[PDB]
Amino acid sequence: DRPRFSFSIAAREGKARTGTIEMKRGVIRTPAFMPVGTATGADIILGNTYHLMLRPGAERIAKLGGLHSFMGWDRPILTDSGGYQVMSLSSLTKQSEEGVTFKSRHMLSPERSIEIQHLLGSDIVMAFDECTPYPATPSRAASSMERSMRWAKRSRDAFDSRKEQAENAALFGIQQGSVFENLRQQSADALAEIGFDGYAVGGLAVGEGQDEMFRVLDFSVPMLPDDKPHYLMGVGKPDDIVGAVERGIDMFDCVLPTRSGRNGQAFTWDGPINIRNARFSEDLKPLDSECHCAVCQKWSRAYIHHLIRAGEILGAMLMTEHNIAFYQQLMQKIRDSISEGRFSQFAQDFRARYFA
Amino acid sequence: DRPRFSFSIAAREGKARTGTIEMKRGVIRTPAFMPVGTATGADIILGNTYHLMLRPGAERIAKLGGLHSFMGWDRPILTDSGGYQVMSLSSLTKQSEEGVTFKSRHMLSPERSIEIQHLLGSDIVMAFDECTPYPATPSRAASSMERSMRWAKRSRDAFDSRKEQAENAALFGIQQGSVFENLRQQSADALAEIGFDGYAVGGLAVGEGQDEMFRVLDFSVPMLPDDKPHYLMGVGKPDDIVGAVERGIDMFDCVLPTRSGRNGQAFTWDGPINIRNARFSEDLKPLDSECHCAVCQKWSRAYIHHLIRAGEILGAMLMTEHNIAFYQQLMQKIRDSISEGRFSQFAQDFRARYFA
Ligand SMILES: CNc1nc2c(CCc3ccc(C(F)(F)F)cc3)c3[nH]c(N)nc(=O)c3cc2[nH]1
Ligand SMILES: CNc1nc2c(CCc3ccc(C(F)(F)F)cc3)c3[nH]c(N)nc(=O)c3cc2[nH]1
Ligand SMILES: [Zn+2]
Numbered sequence: 001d002r003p004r005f006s007f008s009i010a011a012r013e014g015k016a017r018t019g020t021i022e023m024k025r026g027v028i029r030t031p032a033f034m035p036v037g038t039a040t041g042a043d044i045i046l047g048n049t050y051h052l053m054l055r056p057g058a059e060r061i062a063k064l065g066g067l068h069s070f071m072g073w074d075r076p077i078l079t080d081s082g083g084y085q086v087m088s089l090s091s092l093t094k095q096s097e098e099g100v101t102f103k104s105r106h107m108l109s110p111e112r113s114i115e116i117q118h119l120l121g122s123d124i125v126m127a128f129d130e131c132t133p134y135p136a137t138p139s140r141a142a143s144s145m146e147r148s149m150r151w152a153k154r155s156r157d158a159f160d161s162r163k164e165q166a167e168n169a170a171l172f173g174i175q176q177g178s179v180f181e182n183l184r185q186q187s188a189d190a191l192a193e194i195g196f197d198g199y200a201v202g203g204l205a206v207g208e209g210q211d212e213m214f215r216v217l218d219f220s221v222p223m224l225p226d227d228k229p230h231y232l233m234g235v236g237k238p239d240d241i242v243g244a245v246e247r248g249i250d251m252f253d254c255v256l257p258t259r260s261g262r263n264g265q266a267f268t269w270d271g272p273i274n275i276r277n278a279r280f281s282e283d284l285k286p287l288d289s290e291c292h293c294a295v296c297q298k299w300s301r302a303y304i305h306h307l308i309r310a311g312e313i314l315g316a317m318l319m320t321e322h323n324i325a326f327y328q329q330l331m332q333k334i335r336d337s338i339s340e341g342r343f344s345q346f347a348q349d350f351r352a353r354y355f356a
Numbered sequence: 357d358r359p360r361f362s363f364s365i366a367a368r369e370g371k372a373r374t375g376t377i378e379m380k381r382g383v384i385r386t387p388a389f390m391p392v393g394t395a396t397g398a399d400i401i402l403g404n405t406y407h408l409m410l411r412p413g414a415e416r417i418a419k420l421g422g423l424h425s426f427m428g429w430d431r432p433i434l435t436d437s438g439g440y441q442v443m444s445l446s447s448l449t450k451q452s453e454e455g456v457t458f459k460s461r462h463m464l465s466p467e468r469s470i471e472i473q474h475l476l477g478s479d480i481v482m483a484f485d486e487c488t489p490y491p492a493t494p495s496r497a498a499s500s501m502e503r504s505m506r507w508a509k510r511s512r513d514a515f516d517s518r519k520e521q522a523e524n525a526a527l528f529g530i531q532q533g534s535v536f537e538n539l540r541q542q543s544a545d546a547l548a549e550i551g552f553d554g555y556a557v558g559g560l561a562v563g564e565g566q567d568e569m570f571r572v573l574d575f576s577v578p579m580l581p582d583d584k585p586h587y588l589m590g591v592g593k594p595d596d597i598v599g600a601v602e603r604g605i606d607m608f609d610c611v612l613p614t615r616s617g618r619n620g621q622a623f624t625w626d627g628p629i630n631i632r633n634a635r636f637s638e639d640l641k642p643l644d645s646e647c648h649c650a651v652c653q654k655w656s657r658a659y660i661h662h663l664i665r666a667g668e669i670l671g672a673m674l675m676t677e678h679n680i681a682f683y684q685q686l687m688q689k690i691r692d693s694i695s696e697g698r699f700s701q702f703a704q705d706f707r708a709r710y711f712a
């Protein structure tokens with residue numbers, strides 16, 4: 001029987017690592033992409049804490065048997081802590097040391113966030129943090145990070161108080177500190193003193209751009225414990241994933257494939273394409289020449305173009321299936337190239353072709 | 357090797373029949389449901405002549421290899437002749453003995469309709485007819501029907517002039533005459549004198565209601581050749597199908613399953629349900645208790661409700677898959693009950709439960 005949580009590193013190349021997380025409900029191969037659940041297959045999917053806590057509500061999900069039973073998925077599920085989405089989407093918010101109140105009006109605190117994730121039944125639980133807006137001054141970035149670290153300790157204590165959760169799930173802490181090296185170090189130190197099963201890099205993919213994101217990752221990821229998984233939240237494009245793995249990231253949440261699939265964009269080894277464009281109306285090639293997915297084995301760019309231009313649901317479903325398959329082929333190629341000692345060459349080849 | 361076209365009747369109960377159509381690309385079990393292609397599985401699908409002739413155009417479909425290659429379907433395809441949809445959907449129309457002009461502006465004639473269906477490559481080709489509006493006076497119904505019969509002869513001649521079509525496809529004639537027995541008889545006689553591979557009942561499902569539709573079928577279907585298939589165009593609900601089979605119909609076009617699937621309606625043996633309704637938010641049963649489809653084996657009403665309320669494409673795709681599967685289980689139960697001599701009892705049991 002698998003353990004509650006065990007991360008093993010099988011091979012390394014530079015700062016890049018490949019290995020496995022073992023949990024009770026399954027093995028997660030890393031580096032991993034984690035797609036939304038409602039979308040070589042994925043080993044773990046994302047639940048949507050913010051949506052579920054409002055419709056149908058976390059209590060109701062528990063009454064229906066938990067999220068695994070509800071969505072018919074018996075493998076690992078990761079949930080975020082909800083504050084990022086509250087701050088991004090809800091209309092009015094009130095912040096305090098207790099938590100965040102938002103509009104029926106609601107309070108989300110470290111304790112309530114952990115209880116919601118418990119009622120949902122997720123396997124990887126995120127601490128309740130504040131994603132500092134960008135740009136931030138040093139003083140505001142520090143105050144925000146300090147609150148998040150106090151909230152990280154409250155998250156730890158709440159998780160440990162619920163036996164079913166402490167014994168069967170895992171808890172990840174989230175590093176903050178905006179773009180400042182000294183604050184990222186203080187945050188890493190605070191999280192390691194509390195102790196978590198894994199460590200996320202928060203506060204990025206918030207408008208800073210790839211060059212700046214990579215600069216911050218360069219000094220931030222080495223601050224986290226080497227022997228635990230590293231999750232970069234909110235990222236991203238295929239080229240962001242490749243560069244983040246080069247900098248020591250093990251886990252990625254990938255909304256973009258499903259978002260792109262419903263809006264006419266397909267990922268290919270030669271870059272993204274907009275299938276609605278008239279240049280695809282007579283193109284008999286599959287979406288991607290090398291893709292092994294079921295769409296590309298059977299149907300042409302010209303037919304998928306026809307369906308999407310016609311407003312047919314089938315068109316968006318085929319695009320989304322392809323995009324998910326593309327991402328899991330990307331991650332498999334990354335894992336294999338690290339294990340074989342040729343990831344540096346893969347990254348160079350990938351970029352030359354994706355951007356050609 | 358299968359023939360171009362061969363209809364055999366294997367069993368009969370009252371006016372109901374069950375059997376097979378053999379064509380070069382496959383066998384069609386009757387009574388048959390024929391779903392849209394762009395949606396025990398279906399044996400034949402519908403192409404959309406009106407849409408395809410405008411986007412990308414019939415010539416372009418031929419340049420891409422024909423509709424079978426284009427949509428990745430190597431089995432039989434039926435196409436309508438296009439005039440019904442022109443008259444229903446296009447903004448301005450001009451009618452004459454030559455054909456119909458409509459808005460770039462276009463002319464559709466018997467000869468052009470047959471050529472378009474040839475370029476698309478369909479296996480069952482419909483004659484170019486006029487679907488008389490309802491209600492119609494006897495004089496207007498007669499004039500319209502007479503034009504359609506002149507157009508049926510022109511359709512026959514155009515089809516026979518194209519060797520690839522005459523040797524590999526089949527041509528169906530369409531009966532008109534509104535709700536009038538004497539005109540339905542004249543139309544049947546004209547079509548049989550020309551000679552077709554199959555015979556459709558046109559001019560119904562245009563606002564007359566089920567009672568009147570069944571009354572017209574009662575005297576119209578016996579006028580058609582018994583030894584050829586009978587296609588009721590534009591029908592319909594499950595209860596319409598059962599009653600039409602009781603009256604001698606062999607073939608049905610079924611848009612409703614895909615339309616309902618995208619608009620929140622699921623078919624069940626206990627009648628249709630509106631999955632968005634709040635009464636399904638905690639319902640752990642599958643869409644239908646007896647359905648063998650993949651959706652009903654895996655997911656609950658509560659989860660499909662959640663997805664559709666959230667605007668997720670997955671929700672409509674699951675509803676549509678279920679609805680298609682429901683229709684092909686309906687047709688299989690009809691075929692089996694006729695072959696076993698218990699179709700009368702099936703129809704009674706079906707109605708008692710569907711309308712309970
Ligand atoms: C887009 N940029 C970004 N997203 C970020 C997220 C959200 C992660 C998430 C939440 C929900 C889903 C769901 F679709 F499945 F619902 C998917 C992904 C962050 N989350 C937390 N907790 N701290 C952060 O500092 C942080 C930074 C983030 N930058
Ligand atoms: C809805 N009522 C109705 N539909 C009727 C139709 C259209 C059949 C059709 C066409 C295209 C498709 C597509 F979705 F696949 F594109 C699906 C079905 C008729 N067609 C002709 N030729 N004569 C008629 O007298 C007639 C009567 C009809 N009553
Ligand atoms: Zn593909």
Ligand SMILES: [Zn+2]
Pocket residue numbers: 643644647648649650651652653678681682
């Ligand atoms: Zn079903």
